[PDB]
Structure 1
Amino acid sequence: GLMQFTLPVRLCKEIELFHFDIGPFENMWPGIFVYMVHRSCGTSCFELEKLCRFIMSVKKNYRRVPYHNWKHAVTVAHCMYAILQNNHTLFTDLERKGLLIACLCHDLDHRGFSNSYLQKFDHPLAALYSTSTMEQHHFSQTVSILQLEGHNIFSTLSSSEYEQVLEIIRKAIIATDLALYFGNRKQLEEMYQTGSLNLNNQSHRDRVIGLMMTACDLCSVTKLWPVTKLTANDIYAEFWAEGDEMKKLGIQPIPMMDRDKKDEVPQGQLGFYNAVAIPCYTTLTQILPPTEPLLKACRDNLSQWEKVIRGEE
């Protein structure tokens, strides 16, 4: 009850910043997450015995892949924590509970392959879920871990609050499917500009929560350059392995995923920053002004990639 998590001074201060890196000590990541829940939600939101048991079952069900791993989970939850903390009064008690859990669970049991590679492989999950394949699996895995004896962190919610939080978590996880992001942001853009955006409209909140999920999910591009640059290697290690598996199915993969065309990476990152990241954090900053530091950090890193291309690094 009176048991708080406390971090060392440096972390205690840096954790509040959007660009915080959770560090290379795996065994500190659960405490960092519980720290964030206690400050974000309250020391009462979850029974600490059950939260700790949920966190360690979630960790167990992330694989040892180069990027879509436990570190990503906690990193993406931290970005959500930063957004929620800089936007105190915009979110309900249920939304703060749900979204941190959504982010921790959003890539559960990821194998390091796109929905595209599952479809071309003819993976069983591609037959069970025709669209947002992995994301439907991630939500499924979340519900399974919640239903293990002693793991129901939401037990003390009423029936309707329980239904609401699981529905917040389902939409949040589905939205991390980047194929759905383009349309979601376009719609949010129009609604913002025509002035029809309304946070009392549930369908509008859903869309805004989805953009938040994309923003947390891509938050590697909003870190200090050395973190951004080193994470990019982890992302590309998966892409190139997927490229390899495409070649095993007798399919030339797009040049981004082909490990013979590494030269093309910096230009590939420009496309990604201009086509995805900058638009994402632009619309997010328009809807939630205090998330501006994400857009700024993302612009700083675009410029750093421009410098890589111009031979300057």
Structure 2
Amino acid sequence: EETRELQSLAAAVVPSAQTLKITDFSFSDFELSDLETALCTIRMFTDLNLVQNFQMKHEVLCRWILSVKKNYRKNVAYHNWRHAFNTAQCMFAALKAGKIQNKLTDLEILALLIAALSHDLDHRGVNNSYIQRSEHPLAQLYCHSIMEHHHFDQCLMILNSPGNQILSGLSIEEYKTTLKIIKQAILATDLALYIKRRGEFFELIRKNQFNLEDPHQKELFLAMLMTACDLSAITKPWPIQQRIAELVATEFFDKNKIPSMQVGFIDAICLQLYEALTHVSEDCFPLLDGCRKNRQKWQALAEQ
């Protein structure tokens, strides 16, 4: 049934990060089976030293990963398991290739990876729009009166389910700190909260006053990082981004104006974010470079 899946997952060899290409910003998931994305996820926890430092039992981490995946099964494509898996992959690539890993504590890295994986688990719970089909990120802003939201209840419920407690090896003080960061990183994937707080982040960077060691600026930086990862399909190699963008038209759920939608999207949201991210961490330039190349391809298409 799904004992089968867990048994098969826990027994399998976990290939290296290099084999799985999860350290690349150009990572493509389409050829992977769901079960291979779970192996990729295990590898992310492993290479961030989270399995070791917090003594996560292998079977427990496998079951938690499958619990998370299972609870995405009714979500639309922009908020599904593949979305959260890729949000996590971008986080991993930005932590590793982008080197952000070195700037953060282990509890921050742990909360970030769990948040990336879990941030859309409540999409059907806290939204009455947006759940029939994948809606453009900016449909929030211009189309519906009420915006598109995220929550952490499902996240914490799965984390505390018997057999799924990847955090049992934390002390009480570590657990409390981690849950707090998880809650904020999940709420930060609300585009409303990004728009509300980004100008300050940009000013600090413009004025070269950005100080990651300030508790308000660390919260704000972790939030921008969550948004960078959540929106990262806008950075992908052109064929990936085209087919994801077109899901607003192609998703079967039980293309004429898309070029101008995506250019507007890049000009109003995406370009500044990856520009700002690259000033904090120069090795995240591939996200910005990808976002630039896609604007150029979408602009050429808009010129028909």
Q: Same fold (TM over 0.5)?
A: yes
Matching of residues 1-313 of structure 1 within 5 Å: 5-7=14-16, 10-11=19-20, 14-24=21-31, 25-44=33-52, 45=54, 46-64=56-74, 65-85=76-96, 86-87=98-99, 88-111=101-124, 134-136=149-151, 139-237=152-250, 262-311=255-304
Task: For 2:128 and 2:224, locate their aligned partners in 1 and report how far apart those are by CA, in whole Å.
Answer: 20
Aligned-pair CA distance for 1:196: 2.8
Aligned-pair CA distance for 1:110: 2.6
Aligned-pair CA distance for 1:276: 0.6
Task: For 1:68 and 1:117, locate their aligned partners in 2 and report how far apart those are by CA, in whole Å.
Answer: 10
In the alignment, is the contact (CA less than 8 A) between 1:80 and 1:100 conserved in 2? yes
In the alignment, is the contact (CA less than 8 A) between 2:17 and 2:43 conserved in 1? no
In the alignment, is the contact (CA less than 8 A) between 1:99 and 1:169 conserved in 2? yes
In structure 2, do the counterparts of structure 1 residues 8 and 15 end up closer, same or farther at CA, with 3 Å as the change threshold?
closer
Task: For 2:159 and 2:210, locate their aligned partners in 1 and report how far apart those are by CA, in whole Å.
Answer: 34
Structure 2, unpaired ranges of 5+: 1-11, 132-145
Task: For 2:219 and 2:25, locate their aligned partners in 1 and report how far apart those are by CA, in whole Å.
Answer: 22
Name the aligned partner's letter for residue 53 of structure 1.
R
In the alignment, is the contact (CA less than 8 A) between 2:211 and 2:217 conserved in 1? yes
Richer in helix (by share): 1
Task: For 1:93 and 1:66, locate their aligned partners in 2 and report how far apart those are by CA, in whole Å.
Answer: 31
Aligned-pair CA distance for 1:15: 1.9
Aligned-pair CA distance for 1:56: 0.9
Task: For 1:162 and 1:42, locate their aligned partners in 2 and report how far apart those are by CA, in whole Å.
Answer: 14
Task: For 2:126 and 2:293, locate their aligned partners in 1 and report how far apart those are by CA, in whole Å.
Answer: 29
Task: For 1:187 and 1:95, locate their aligned partners in 2 and report how far apart those are by CA, in whole Å.
Answer: 22
CA RMSD of aligned residues (A): 2.5
Instruction: Give me the TM-score of the superposition, normalised by structure 2.
Output: 0.82
Task: For 1:41 and 1:10, locate their aligned partners in 2 and report how far apart those are by CA, in whole Å.
Answer: 18
In the alignment, is the contact (CA less than 8 A) between 1:41 and 1:96 conserved in 2? no
Aligned-pair CA distance for 1:289: 1.5
Aligned-pair CA distance for 1:218: 0.6
Name the aligned partner's letter for residue 30 of structure 2.
G
In the alignment, is the contact (CA less than 8 A) between 1:176 and 1:214 conserved in 2? yes
Aligned length: 272
In structure 2, do the counterparts of structure 1 residues 211 and 105 end up closer, same or farther at CA, with 3 Å as the change threshold?
same
Task: For 1:4 and 1:218, locate their aligned partners in 2 and report how far apart those are by CA, in whole Å.
Answer: 31
The alignment partner of 1:134 has SS state of: coil
In the alignment, is the contact (CA less than 8 A) between 2:234 and 2:291 conserved in 1? yes
Structure 1, unpaired ranges of 5+: 119-130, 242-261
